[PDB]
Amino acid sequence: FQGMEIKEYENNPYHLAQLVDLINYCQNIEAKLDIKMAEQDDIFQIENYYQNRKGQFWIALENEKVVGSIALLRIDDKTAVLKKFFTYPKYRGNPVRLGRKLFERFMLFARASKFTRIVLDTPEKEKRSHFFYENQGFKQITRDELDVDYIFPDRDSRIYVKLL
Template structure:
């Protein structure tokens, strides 16, 4: 079991890129069997320009040895709307009450509030049932594609869509 102090949440840095991509692809393809390449999600190959340069954010959870244990991104779509993306936590750090998932998500929410974002949407593969439960506990509600407030590209793998309106 890992302790809260063994994880640090840091803004994305380019020297973490290879680890970030490896973690995301491992969870998507080895664990979830989604079958998606890095080329099908070009945002992970260009985090700086896809997230940070557009007024969004991307955060990384590092374990006690400085290895990437989790990721979360907020891709800004317009002045008040953003897409939560690339929310992944390494298997050995999942399900802990003060683990990286809760802390990454809290970092994203604090940033969104400070940046004037009012609505966060996300897509997640239908097979990711554990993620669906997390999002619903966090106040997201399932929506239809027609109800998305912004249009954005995502690799549709039987995806479910969720929306959170911030206070």
């Protein structure tokens, strides 16, 4: 799409500020989840938390401004978590399909890394996201029935899984 690119995060205070605004908007202005940045301080240490541990963090830029994000966190050789998946509303669905484009980039990396299972959680009230995830091939699963070396936040959220 015109003037738009998705790329791996690199330390940049301008993009980081924009990323924080994106996350805050989606979580707290749009979804009203009241999530503090202290509850997700990995955002302030992306290189060490994601990139240096066989994971990755991507940002979508429109005219060099952050308008979307997605991250992959490695749990083990087989399992990865899809995290920090956000897009500003106007980039969702037609015509830009930014969520799909971010999700596609996540997967080129996930497959190349030989992961066989991708897990994620999503708030129970986020119906739009649930249909989006199901259209990318994710199936819902129980928290007590998924065995994974990862703890999902203590919120009213659904767990989804996609086997590669």
